[PDB]
Amino acid sequence: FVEMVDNLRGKSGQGYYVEMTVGSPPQTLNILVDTGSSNFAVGAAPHPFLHRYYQRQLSSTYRDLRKGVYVPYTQGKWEGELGTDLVSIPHGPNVTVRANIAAITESDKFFINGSNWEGILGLAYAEIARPDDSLEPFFDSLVKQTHVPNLFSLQLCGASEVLASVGGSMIIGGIDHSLYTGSLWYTPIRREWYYEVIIVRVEINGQDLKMDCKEYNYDKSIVDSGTTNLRLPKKVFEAAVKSIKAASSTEKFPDGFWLGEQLVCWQAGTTPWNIFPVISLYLMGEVTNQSFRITILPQQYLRPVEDVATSQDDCYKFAISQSSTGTVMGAVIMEGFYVVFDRARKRIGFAVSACHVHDEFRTAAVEGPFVTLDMEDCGYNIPQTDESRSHHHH
Ligand SMILES: O=C(OCc1ccccc1)[C@H]1C[C@]2(CN1)C(=O)Nc1ccccc12
Numbered sequence: 455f456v457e458m459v460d461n462l463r464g465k466s467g468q469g470y471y472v473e474m475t476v477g478s479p480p481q482t483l484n485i486l487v488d489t490g491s492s493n494f495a496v497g498a499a500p501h502p503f504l505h506r507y508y509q510r511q512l513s514s515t516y517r518d519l520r521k522g523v524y525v526p527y528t529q530g531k532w533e534g535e536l537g538t539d540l541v542s543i544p545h546g547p548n549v550t551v552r553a554n555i556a557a558i559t560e561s562d563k564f565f566i567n568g569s570n571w572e573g574i575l576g577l578a579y580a581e582i583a584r585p586d587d588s589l590e591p592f593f594d595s596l597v598k599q600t601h602v603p604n605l606f607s608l609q610l611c612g613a614s615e616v617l618a619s620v621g622g623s624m625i626i627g628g629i630d631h632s633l634y635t636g637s638l639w640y641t642p643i644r645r646e647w648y649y650e651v652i653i654v655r656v657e658i659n660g661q662d663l664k665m666d667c668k669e670y671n672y673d674k675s676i677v678d679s680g681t682t683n684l685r686l687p688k689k690v691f692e693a694a695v696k697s698i699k700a701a702s703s704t705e706k707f708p709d710g711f712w713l714g715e716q717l718v719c720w721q722a723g724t725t726p727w728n729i730f731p732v733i734s735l736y737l738m739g740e741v742t743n744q745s746f747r748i749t750i751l752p753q754q755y756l757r758p759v760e761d762v763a764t765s766q767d768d769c770y771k772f773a774i775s776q777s778s779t780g781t782v783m784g785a786v787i788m789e790g791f792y793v794v795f796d797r798a799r800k801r802i803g804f805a806v807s808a809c810h811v812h813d814e815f816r817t818a819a820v821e822g823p824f825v826t827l828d829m830e831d832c833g834y835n836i837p838q839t840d841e842s843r844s845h846h847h848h
């Protein structure tokens with residue numbers, strides 16, 4: 455799928471985006487690739503952080519759905535007017551789709567200064583579309599309207615006055631074998647809403663955290679390209695950081711570093727990678743009592759950032775952080791791996807990325823099988839609110 459190789463760009467820490475066209479004539483927009491949400495939504499009015507935006511009234515193929523939409527996140531919210539239009543991905547498949555589009559008329563802490571994207575492409579399932587699950591997501595429309603197979607795959611590649619440029623590939627409708635090496639291992643999608651999966655064990659430099667495994671998935675574990683960190687439930691974050699602190703303890707950093715709010719630096723090219731431990735997440739296998747591990751390096755979870763005040767140093771931000779809404783395997787995790795979103799077979803594949811950043815002692819790894827007898831169930835069951843219970847689904 456050569457024409458889709460290297461179709462993503464962005465700034466380190468600010469999202470990976472793909473070029474899309476909406477409307478007739480086609481308006482080009484840079485759109486964030488987000489597997490943690492299910493709306494297609496584009497800036498449609500002026501904003502300090504947007505160079506440009508979708509102008510509905512200039513598209514001869516726009517239809518207004520006469521209905522508004524509102525999505526709040528933990529960080530960020532937007533709102534706008536729903537409609538449909540013609541949408542294509544120039545460096546994607548050679549098709550054109552009529553899809554739902556949310557035209558964002560207002561927003562708060564959503565757009566990111568300097569990120570260069572003007573909208574979001576939510577690739578997850580209808581169950582978490584807003585206003586509700588009858589708003590068909592983009593990928594569902596693409597599959598229904600064209601012959602494109604029901605899978606996509608992501609290779610996110612990690613990196614003085616601007617942040618580092620990043621690149622990646624979104625292969626729509628298949629798997630490109632040049633983007634990985636070694637075995638591709640699949641974990642089932644637990645439920646089709648998020649890309650929810652189940653972590654059964656976590657190791658830091660070979661050592662088990664030894665928590666009840668439901669903690670790893672409290673209250674869910676999801677794969678989200680639009681989240682930049684590996685985010686971990688509070689209790690798991692405190693244990694993991696305790697173990698990383700212990701391994702690295704020849705270096706005493708500020709509190710702010712471990713809080714993800716402060717760089718630490720070494721003389722150029724002298725970063726002591728080998729004092730930071732590898733982190734291994736064991737994911738449920740397709741077979742009962744089987745799992746496989748994805749192992750990331752500090753080159754994934756320490757993000758490079760060039761200090762203006764000390765440009766001769768190599769500086770890093772800690773990109774593991776605390777969550778109250780479950781584990782999020784964000785770009786930090788994904789930057790180790792080629793990730794196959796096999797919606798057709800209700801599973802997610804991982805293989806070692808041909809573009810992952812490593813050194814001569816260590817590599818990001820995908821390894822299995824590992825076997826447990828009489829395994830626990832590690833899934834958490836979210837409390838059902840009456841609101842959620844009252845919804846009909848016809
Ligand atoms: O996780 C996510 O949506 C949850 C969700 C909540 C509510 C409805 C459906 C899904 C998406 C959206 C995301 C990163 N991924 C984030 O939450 N804020 C933010 C800010 C800017 C860009 C991307 C994001």
Ligand SMILES: [Zn+2]
Pocket residue numbers: 846847848
């Ligand atoms: Zn009903």
